[PDB]
Amino acid sequence: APVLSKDVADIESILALNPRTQSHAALHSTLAKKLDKKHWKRNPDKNCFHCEKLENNFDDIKHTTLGERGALREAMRCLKCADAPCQKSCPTHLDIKSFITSISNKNYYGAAKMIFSDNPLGLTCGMVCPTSDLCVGGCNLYATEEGSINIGGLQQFASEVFKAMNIPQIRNPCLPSQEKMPEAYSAKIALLGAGPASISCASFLARLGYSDITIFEKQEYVGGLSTSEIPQFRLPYDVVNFEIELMKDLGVKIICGKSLSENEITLNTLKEEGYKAAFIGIGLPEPKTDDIFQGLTQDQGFYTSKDFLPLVAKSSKAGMCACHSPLPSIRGAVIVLGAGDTAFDCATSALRCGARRVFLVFRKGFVNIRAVPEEVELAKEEKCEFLPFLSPRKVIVKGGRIVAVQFVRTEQDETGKWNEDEDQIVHLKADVVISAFGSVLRDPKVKEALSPIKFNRWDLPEVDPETMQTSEPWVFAGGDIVGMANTTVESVNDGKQASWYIHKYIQAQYGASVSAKPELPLFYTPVDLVDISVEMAGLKFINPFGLASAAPTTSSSMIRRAFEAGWGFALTKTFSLDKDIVTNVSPRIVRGTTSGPMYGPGQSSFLNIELISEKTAAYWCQSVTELKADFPDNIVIASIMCSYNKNDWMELSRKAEASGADALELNLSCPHGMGLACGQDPELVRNICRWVRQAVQIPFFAKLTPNVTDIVSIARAAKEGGADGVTATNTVSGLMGLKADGTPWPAVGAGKRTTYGGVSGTAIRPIALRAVTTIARALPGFPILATGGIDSAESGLQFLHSGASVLQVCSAVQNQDFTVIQDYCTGLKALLYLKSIEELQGWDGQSPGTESHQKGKPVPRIAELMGKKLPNFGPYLEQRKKIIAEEKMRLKEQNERKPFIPKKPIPAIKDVIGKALQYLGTFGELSNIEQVVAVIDEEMCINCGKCYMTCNDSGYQAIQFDPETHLPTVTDTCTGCTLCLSVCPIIDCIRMVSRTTPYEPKRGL
Amino acid sequence: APVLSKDVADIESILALNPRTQSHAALHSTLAKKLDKKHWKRNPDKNCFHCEKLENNFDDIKHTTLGERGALREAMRCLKCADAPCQKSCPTHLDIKSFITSISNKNYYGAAKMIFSDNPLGLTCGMVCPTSDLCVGGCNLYATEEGSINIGGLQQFASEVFKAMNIPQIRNPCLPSQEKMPEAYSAKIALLGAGPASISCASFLARLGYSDITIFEKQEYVGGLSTSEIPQFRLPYDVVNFEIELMKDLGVKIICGKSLSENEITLNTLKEEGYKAAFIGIGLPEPKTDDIFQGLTQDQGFYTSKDFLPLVAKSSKAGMCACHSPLPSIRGAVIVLGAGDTAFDCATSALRCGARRVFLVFRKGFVNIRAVPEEVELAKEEKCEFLPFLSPRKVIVKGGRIVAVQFVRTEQDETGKWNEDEDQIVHLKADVVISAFGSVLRDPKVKEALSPIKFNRWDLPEVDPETMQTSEPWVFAGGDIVGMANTTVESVNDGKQASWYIHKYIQAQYGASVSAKPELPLFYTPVDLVDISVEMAGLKFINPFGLASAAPTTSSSMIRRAFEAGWGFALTKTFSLDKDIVTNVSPRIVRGTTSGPMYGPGQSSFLNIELISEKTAAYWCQSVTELKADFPDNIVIASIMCSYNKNDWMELSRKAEASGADALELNLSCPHMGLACGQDPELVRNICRWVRQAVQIPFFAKLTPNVTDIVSIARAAKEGGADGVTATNTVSGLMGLKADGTPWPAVGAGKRTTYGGVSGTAIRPIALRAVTTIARALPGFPILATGGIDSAESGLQFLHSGASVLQVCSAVQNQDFTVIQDYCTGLKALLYLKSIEELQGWDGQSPGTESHQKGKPVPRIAELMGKKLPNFGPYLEQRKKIIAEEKMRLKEQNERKPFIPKKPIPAIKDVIGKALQYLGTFGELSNIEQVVAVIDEEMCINCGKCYMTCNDSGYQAIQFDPETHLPTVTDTCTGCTLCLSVCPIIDCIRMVSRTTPYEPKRGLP
């Protein structure tokens, strides 16, 4: 017979690339290394002077785009700062802390709601905001080596998921019915220009209740520059359409083919027609021109950005127009003049039109570029050449075509003045010239249509920077036309700012006043109407979330603020009779070491050696009376503890009941004598519950410790004793760790002493979930208040599904603050709402089904790629690029949005409780016939070989790892243990599927 | 009475910036936002065209430098890939996977050892390698949004900590005594030039045993370009000195003031003197010059990089030269000609000399820049202006000074071909001109000294790319002189490559052969001599680490490979008699959800529903016989399980003993106070009694943590005759449910599951408590620890807790068997460091945390400390001004010895149970020795997490400044320690003895 403990030839071969520590230094010549390097190349090659062909390629090129995997990582990284500087640096004042917290908790709906509440064009902005000069520029994490947070990408991700949910925006639920609205809200309102500014203004006015809002747009398309000029490869047109439809959900009307101009629409005609207010948001309609380009035509090869970009947009944005137009034929060398976003977008867009080479020419130096570094990077990575200190002087035309442009050198003198050197010239060959100096408002007919408002020095409408009001009280203006800023978000903010004062003005015209403090409404959807209340043990909870008896309930003043924030209920820190007064030691609460040396947000656990409340029973009882008086609908549960003494338990419970507590929670941590604690002995628990039951009439719950062999026996004892339910569970006994010198942490006093503490947080969730599930199955219907690692609506729902009715939280608040309640509530509403949407059954909660991707970007479904074994690196990547380019050329030759409606009642909390219990059982109830095997999606793989390493040293050596492509392949020896899927860095790259081939366990002999 | 549940004015004030969800959208004008943005600005302002003052400022400007906090985060992020592409892309073939794994496990020594084993200039390279064109360029994580790993920074960090340990390099321990070495090793060896190439070559030759190695250096200083030209602000001179001294530890001699030149040292004179081999590593000594600069002097303002950089280095690098030297007085506009590293370093260095403005002039375009993006970024961020397509023609000299440089425009045609346009000129004003075209070897005297070796077309020494041998068999060459590459790492590799063939050549000259397979020695230090063996229950373990009975021991072939890797011991997967045969289900092993949606490396836990081994007892017994036959020194423990039956346990135990197992481990998971035998003291006692009377070898009872009192079970096992206990098995739990209520793992069409066992770091607190409580209750009773052991550090925690050996499962599932190397070097280092008196302030391998920002030391300037100047907005501007003034003040103001153990290095037996002295009851903790939190404002990153945690989970004791976002702990602090626990910056907050009167908050008197 064979050497059983040895790998046969076949296995030794499959293990060829398995890591093995070397006993000697390696020997590889420098020449050999130079030759091997190209095979594994992932990033750009600095020695490569030409970037792949991009003709007709409008694929997303943003470096900030995130997929779910990446978004969760980045969201978890965010410090979720107080008085956040990023928010202060955001023109629309987005509550970044809150929306990123929501993303980290997988509550994409809540994140999107927060985003759109302050920015109606939340998705567009996430994609195009020059964050380095805005929110990200103020990020505290810039002070770390890893750097600032990708705020834009996170905003984009949450907004994209919300868009995919196809949920409509609704009228504010707290507004009176449309027919009960004061006459003033029917005032005819007009907005000129359907760009970011007007879309934002109209949206906020609609939120306030105005029912007659009309945006008059000159063109046949809507969205402004977001549609007509920003490239499809930066901002997909479907994003613009999505935001406009959300606005239309509020009743805003849009009429195209209508222009603000003499003989057409004017302020006078609007006033004559009965309009009560007007918002001017027409932007800067004309290109900034240069005399030297006079007379040049497109046929000769000359374009202004205003000519060029819309042509490319109309050809690349399906839905923009009804016309099916061809992409501008740009052949040869292209010269783009300018240093702002316009210039860089013209440069990159020129490449999509077939340009062989592109030159970005600046009048000043590289240091003076106006576009943010991130925008510049897109042109630079696509090999556009930059030529600084250049001023155009002449354009040479031959054979009806531009063939060159002559420039003069420019300089900065000992004064700060820019001069041109006539004797120093440049003759640059070029076939196409695109002027991208910027835009302005010149049309005399448009200016005349704005009579008689005052215009400033810059010949632009003058407005009060705070109210956005022009010299005419009923006319306001915002966006590019005001000339203060040139960003989508600032234009959106201008409309937002204007909406409040337009509201104030209109109300005043109808003899009504408005609050001195601005009150623009938030963003709402049907999800917000979802009822998340629940009844348990005769008590009505407005929502299932509450504060556990712990550090967050150290003082009643804290509970008050928690109720003000929206928490459904709260436990007082555990208190006792005066004779049981205690004194805490310090340090006493430490971070968990359960997930490695990761500091800051999201600690996976905490350990504490804290005692009961140091505050008296008198303080707590009076506090309870105060809290119940001010928050009658918020449930207050008094947590109490006594030694094993009947008179004490009856005295304290009665005192707590007399204070007005809705219920009591009995802390069974007091030692005695099965263990040392009362909560570890069924007999003691039964008696304690009996004493309390005969002492009070209100409901009471026994808080169980997980530190027992059979927690069900304790729960049963409590039930037999008269308890109305149980709280599962308290903290897990443990020792968090020791320093290298052997001393503990926490370390108390000069002696550096410690004692076993209680572990809390996500690290103990598996223990708490098992406890809740086992009790729910053994004692059906017996109320369970869950506690142990609840830190999101998703995790909360897991406990509800496991049999719990309400959810207590401690560690999640210690890791953050009381505002997480907003996230938990919107998150739970969303989870319940989605269960009624038939079209989204493939999603896992708020997570869309994972689509094949790389870096969060969808993988091209080209027949010429699937199954080609072409990883994203080295020569293989070059091949992929060639195939994609050919596909784009092939697509070139070859030349609606409805909201989902619930198709079933939205489940209430009571309808989901215990629903997961049906899947639990004994091991014997599990099928050993229905086996599975792992299957890898090569298109999502990042070639790390972790699946391979795990199967090799922790599995069945069933994966082949290719030595050239670093692509893994699961073979037929797979047993479906699932370890590979469990260690894979890419979500859903590996999936377990039903085994189709014969299965037979490996018996060795 | 007052309203107890309400915050008084004072507290309401302190809570002013505490987060509170808003009920309405915010209103802030665009103008207001523009004005407020500047206050919080962290990153560079794109509108700022003037670079900060950098005169005489040589502070580290590398973006890759990491501090411990940052290094740990990045190391944990690394996928630690199989057949890693980063290593393949590293010229010295560094085992990046392994050294980064060591860093993630806090084993900086092991990381440094791995680095230096393949690269003698590991620290220099970590700091200067153009990683984007090397290792990082092939990083698999480039395929994720977050991007590739900062490999260089990690290498730099580990190497810096090692440098701080001040541990010397030693001769290979396995080499024969110096006196027993064959005569061949005394062969006189000469190396020319003390740069990276020669330092590397000499180092490896010394490792091989050569005792007469001399490097002859022309200059008075050593280190080559690392010393003479690379800026101090990129590569501190102390780094070079450190690596030089490590080499000298091996006996290599360096003689300065000796040149390879016709009238001095020549190949002929060396041969005449008896030298047996010579390595030429003199680099490229002369600057590449241009005819137009002929005659220009430094006084006129002209320098070549070879003139300039050494001048700056000599004045900025303390220790480089004997006497002090002044910083070149560079005033006015500076023109730097070139596009490689040389040019960019000249540009940045010019600013340190006082340059007002710097222009980098390129003959080609920006796209053609030779330096990697990361090098270019340093000059660009310092506002250097770049002028492309420029070729110098004349240096206008008036009044004995350069006043300008006249250039001609350049361009590229059809076949690339570079032309110069004579009619297109530029007259650029400048006061200083620095040519940085590169370097060459031209000195006829030096070339003649190399007679008669063959030179190639490039007039450089010709060498075989594989052996580095010249036309003369006894002469080799490497580094810049060969002209193949221009990087420190490639030069180091050239010397490394040459060392093996020099060795082969010398041995052959003495009539000795060498292995066909290259065998360069690894890097060693005294730490490697540390004994980590331990004896337990009469068994001798070569090291305390072993594989737990689990997935990593699924097959005996795997245990074999584990022993080959170096694991001290291993458990077989639990096996039973034929009648108890089982069949596993699938899926059965899933990742933990204990630390959020973080995928890939370092899962914080796993859950499994796996059964005992599916392989027969016959297979395992034969396997044990085989394993013990081949690995007699590695301990093999047979894990067995039977139902509650005497005959069965006696039969199986005897069968396992007969196979040759060193010991047995009894799995007490079989259902027979719970449902398992391990949960009942009576059953455990009996089972152990049966086995005790059946076998003579030692046996250990594996305890389950799922019990009220684990000590009672351990005691039962001891009373039953067990020789020790294994604490502990997995924790019972449910890892989680999907949003639809289905579990994971989900088995079969019914998507069923059952309670599984949780393993990994998430259960370490439970296992640590178990080990410590058992160790305290049963002094001296052997304990084998299991539960979250994933590093030498964590292993030491268990040893300190009372365990003698350490079992591992999850850490291997997360990686592979090679972690054993990390654990062993890590434990050796931890024990070694305990003997170093000067490092007592360190926590294990972690140096005391110094005040820093982004890992860089905070300047200790009197006008900075206590100024309340955070690192953002106007405050940052002030800080920079203060620092610049300090640098000017410093301008106004014109040995490395190894630590020696001063106590015996502790053996494992000396550390076991040392932590027990600190554990006790809560009553044994002092409630009088209280502490309070103290924040180091210089380390703060202004997130406000301490503030939020104290507000909603504490005592509202922290003031958070509304302008500086700096926190201040007030006297109401109770020392609970939550703030310190949530702070993202390691050691920013520290707990200190309270000095002011302490009185517990009672709420009511």
Ligand SMILES: Cc1cc2nc3c(=O)[nH]c(=O)nc-3n(C[C@H](O)[C@H](O)[C@H](O)COP(=O)(O)O)c2cc1C
């Ligand atoms: C997939 C898997 C299989 C296991 N199989 C066994 C087994 O057969 N016998 C046993 O005594 N313990 C078994 N264990 C438990 C381990 O030996 C070890 O006690 C546990 O995982 C705790 O250590 P860790 O934190 O290093 O993983 C298993 C654990 C896992 C994850």
